[PDB]
């Protein structure tokens, strides 16, 4: 059953012609298995035999699935799709269940031969030419040509979709408010009507579509209530991913690990808490899916910490615009945060996680804010709205942050919340130099080639000190030098440096960085009373640097 719908105009890429592939014949029972279909497809009008004119060929395959009772054929337009223009991103984006409205009754219709009913541009047909020679290859004159949308062809999805949207147009007019979503070969119709009253409109729709050439194989409903779409399991008032099982080996590889992370992240949507900090930190090695990565102690305590949640099923609610939106964020540590969005208390709408990776040493606040972002963006993408934010942070601490920081930002409606992992700023460097504090002119370097450096300092009150180092960078030195300046200093101190690099990291006021040293320095910065810090040129710089660096250089 063809469709009387206006076919969209299709052409090839600028100065490009259609495929011509005289495929090698096969005098098998397969050759007859085709005619069984073609000479019943042309009958149904789907295809048509064309004259021995110019129409160029395309590969054909009469293969059938494993034990498939119905010996169905399939043609692959690998080269054609190369020549045909580009269309509109059929399914560019994806609808997230978390942003749907609870419907009382729903039913899914199978639009299999949907593509086989939608017509094709009368001027593009010729490109779909294909042929099939029999036994002694004495009769190659069995050439056909598509009239509807060919399965697996480039435009088939976009067009069909397009056509379909236009076919539902008038239906959702005579009876609007009826939710209808199409996806590939699926039609999710949902309405807030009683089973009977609901099933009424369905048959209407069916006949409606039937009058457009497109047929619905299943009589009424056939798809069982628990739906599986893109992994998502759908229910009238709840959603989740029923199947979410991750096996346990003893010596897996990158190939398996990526998938593990994949599944874990996938579950992040609902399963609150699911972390992957250490679980992924190891994939940093040169990608080789067949290379076995030894599990670490933390990787162990994590997977197990994860499985704990995954072992027990948890669901998600739907959207109700009438109620306001809200989301709460909580810190998990090591740069890992988790968020949950909901309308009704504990009536989880959806959850997720954000992580500042590949980079290092960053303020706790910067993240909280970065977190707010990911969400905001996500909120809008899904509900097209910004949620009220419930986050663990004092207004004051936050205020001083944006007032002190350089990069500009904006955190909308937000309110305070209490939780052990209370995010805050533990220290602040003195703006103006401290008057009654010792001064620690510091310096540090390393013979880049030899890898051996020297860190140390000198004070206003001639209190020098120097400590050799090996197997470290010029940077690790500059930092070490300060840790020192801190160690041997009092409660309130002023420190001078020659490294613009060292300067930054500190001002960032980060914390809990994987870098052992940085931690040893942070803890010092917290204990201290007052702490001023200044910066001056490394080489041609004086102020003392013209004698502090001449003291830390010995070897090359």
Ligand X SMILES: CC(=O)c1ccc(C)cc1N[C@H](C(N)=O)c1c(Cl)cccc1Cl
The residues in 72-111 that bind ligand X, with binding defined as CB under 6 A, are: 95, 100-101, 103, 106
> Is 185 labeled as ligand-binding?
yes
**Cα 549 → chain centroid:** 49
> Is 549 labeled as ligand-binding?
yes
Q: Is 537 in the site for other proteins (CB under 8 A)?
A: yes
Among the residue ranges 33-41, 341-349, 408-416, 521-529, the one whose residues contact other proteins (CB under 8 A): 408-416
Q: Is 270 in the site for ligand X (CB under 6 A)?
A: no
- DSSP classification of residue 381: H
Q: State the binding partner of 385 from other proteins, ligand X, none, CB within 5 to 8 A by kind.
A: other proteins
Residue among 73 and 350 whose Cβ is closer to other proteins = 350
CB of 183 to ligand X, least distance (A): 6
Span 490-509, contacts to other proteins by CB under 8 A: 494, 496, 500, 503-504, 507-508
Q: Is 170 in the site for other proteins (CB under 8 A)?
A: no
**Cα–Cα distance between 244 and 271 in angstroms, integer?**
11
**Cα–Cα distance between 69 and 74 in angstroms, integer?**
15
Residue among 1 and 541 whose Cβ is closer to other proteins = 541
- Listed residue (253, 237, 242) closest to 291, CA to CA: 253
> Is 237 labeled as ligand-binding?
no
Extended beta strands in 177-309, E state: 179-183, 186-191, 227-229, 232-234, 239-240
Among the residue ranges 85-93, 266-274, 329-337, 341-349, the one whose residues contact other proteins (CB under 8 A): 85-93
**Residue 33 burial (10 A CB sphere; 0-12, 13-18, 19+):** middle
> Is 113 labeled as ligand-binding?
no
> Is 320 labeled as ligand-binding?
no
> Is 110 labeled as ligand-binding?
yes
What's the order of all strands across the beta sheet hosting 105-110? Answer: 105-110, 186-191, 179-183
**Cα–Cα distance between 17 and 84 in angstroms, integer?**
9
Backbone angles phi, psi at 156, to 5 degrees: -35, -45
Sign of CA dihedral 156, 157, 159, 161: positive
Q: State the binding partner of 433 from other proteins, ligand X, none, CB within 5 to 8 A by kind.
A: other proteins
Q: Is 553 in the site for other proteins (CB under 8 A)?
A: no
- In Å, the largest CA–CA distance within the chain is 106
Q: Is 400 in the site for other proteins (CB under 8 A)?
A: no
Span 264-283, contacts to other proteins by CB under 8 A: none
What's the order of all strands across the beta sheet hosting 232-234? Answer: 227-229, 232-234, 239-240
The pair of structure tokens assigned to 141 is 């004159």
Q: Exactly one of 19, 55, 190, 392 binds ligand X (CB under 6 A); which one?
A: 190
| Contacting residues for 49 by C-beta, under 8 A, at least 6 apart | 42, 142, 143, 144, 145
**Cα 227 → chain centroid:** 23
C-alpha distances in Å from residue 9, one per residue of 111, 122, 164 = 23, 9, 16
Sign of CA dihedral 62, 187, 383, 102: negative
The pair of structure tokens assigned to 91 is 């399914």
Q: State the binding partner of 106 from other proteins, ligand X, none, CB within 5 to 8 A by kind.
A: ligand X
Q: Exactly one of 381, 491, 526, 554 binds other proteins (CB under 8 A); which one?
A: 381
**Cα–Cα distance between 34 and 316 in angstroms, integer?**
48
Write the DSSP assignment of 254-281 as a string of letters. Answer: HHHHHHHHHHHHHHTTTSTT---HHHHH
Residue among 38 and 329 whose Cβ is closer to other proteins = 329
Stretch 220-239: interaction string toward ligand X, x if CB under 6 A: -------x-x----x-----
CB of 130 to ligand X, least distance (A): 34
Span 430-449, contacts to other proteins by CB under 8 A: 432-435, 439, 441
Q: Is 157 in the site for ligand X (CB under 6 A)?
A: no
Among the residue ranges 138-146, 236-244, 372-380, 522-530, the one whose residues contact other proteins (CB under 8 A): 372-380
Residue among 119 and 190 whose Cβ is closer to ligand X = 190
Q: State the binding partner of 229 from ligand X, other proteins, none, CB within 5 to 8 A by kind.
A: ligand X
Residue among 98 and 479 whose Cβ is closer to ligand X = 98
Q: Exactly one of 177, 286, 406, 418 binds other proteins (CB under 8 A); which one?
A: 406
Q: Which residues bind ligand X (CB under 6 A)?
A: 95, 100-101, 103, 106, 179, 181, 183, 188-190, 227, 229, 234
Q: Which residues are annotated as a binding site for Mg(2+)?
A: 110, 185-186, 443, 478, 498, 549
């Amino acid at each position: 059953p063809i469709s009387p719908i206006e076919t969209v105009p299709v052409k090839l890429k600028p100065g490009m012609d259609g495929p011509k592939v005289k495929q090698w014949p096969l005098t098998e029972e397969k050759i007859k298995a085709l005619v069984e279909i073609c000479t019943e497809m042309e009958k149904e009008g789907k295809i048509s035999k064309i004259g021995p004119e110019n129409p160029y060929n395309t590969p054909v395959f009469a293969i059938k699935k494993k034990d498939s009772t119905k010996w169905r054929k399939l043609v692959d337009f690998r080269e054609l799709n190369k020549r045909t223009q580009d269309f509109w991103e059929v399914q560019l984006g994806i609808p997230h269940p978390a942003g749907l409205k609870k419907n009382k009754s729903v039913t899914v219709l199978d639009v299999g031969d949907a593509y086989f009913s939608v017509p094709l541009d009368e001027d593009f047909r010729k490109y779909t030419a294909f042929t099939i020679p029999s036994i002694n290859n004495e009769t190659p004159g069995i050439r056909y040509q598509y009239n509807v949308l060919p399965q697996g062809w480039k435009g088939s999805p976009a067009i069909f979709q397009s056509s379909m949207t236009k076919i539902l147009e008038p239906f959702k007019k005579q009876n609007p408010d009826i939710v209808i979503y199409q996806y590939m070969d699926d039609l999710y119709v949902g309405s807030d009507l009683e089973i009977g009253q609901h099933r009424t409109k369905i048959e209407e729709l069916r006949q409606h579509l039937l009058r457009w050439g497109l047929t619905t194989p299943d009589k009424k409903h056939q798809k069982e209530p628990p739906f599986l779409w893109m992994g998502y399991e759908l229910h009238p008032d709840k959603w989740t991913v029923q199947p979410i099982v991750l096996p346990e080996k003893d010596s897996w590889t990158v190939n398996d690990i990526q998938k593990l992370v994949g599944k874990l992240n996938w579950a992040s949507q609902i399963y609150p808490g699911i972390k992957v900090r250490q679980l992924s930190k190891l994939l940093r090695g040169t990608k080789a899916l067949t290379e076995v990565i030894p599990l670490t102690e933390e990787a162990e305590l994590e997977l197990a910490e994860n499985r704990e949640i995954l072992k027990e099923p948890v669901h998600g609610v739907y959207y109700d615009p009438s109620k306001d939106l809200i989301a709460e964020i909580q810190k998990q540590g090591q740069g890992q945060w988790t968020y949950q969005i909901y309308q009704e208390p504990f009536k989880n709408l959806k959850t997720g996680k954000y992580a500042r990776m590949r980079g290092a040493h960053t303020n706790d606040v910067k993240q909280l804010t970065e977190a707010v972002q990911k969400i905001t963006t996500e909120s809008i993408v899904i509900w097209g709205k910004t949620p009220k934010f419930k986050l663990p942070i004092q207004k004051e601490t936050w205020e001083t942050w944006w007032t002190e920081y350089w990069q500009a930002t904006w955190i909308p409606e937000w309110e305070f919340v209490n939780t052990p992992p209370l995010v805050k700023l533990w220290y602040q460097l003195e703006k103006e130099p401290i008057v009654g504090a010792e001064t620690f002119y510091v310096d540090g370097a390393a013979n880049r080639e030899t890898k051996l450096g020297k860190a140390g300092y000198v004070t206003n009150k001639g209190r020098q000190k120097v400590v050799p180092l090996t197997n470290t960078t010029n940077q690790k030195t500059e930092l070490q030098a300060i840790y020192l300046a801190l160690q041997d200093s009092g409660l309130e101190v002023n420190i001078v440096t020659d490294s613009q690099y060292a300067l930054g990291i500190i001002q960032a006021q980060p914390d809990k960085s994987e870098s052992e040293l940085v931690n040893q320095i942070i803890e010092q910065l917290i204990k201290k009373e007052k702490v001023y810090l200044a910066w001056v040129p490394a080489h041609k710089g004086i102020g003392g640097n013209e004698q502090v660096d001449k003291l830390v250089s010995a070897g090359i």
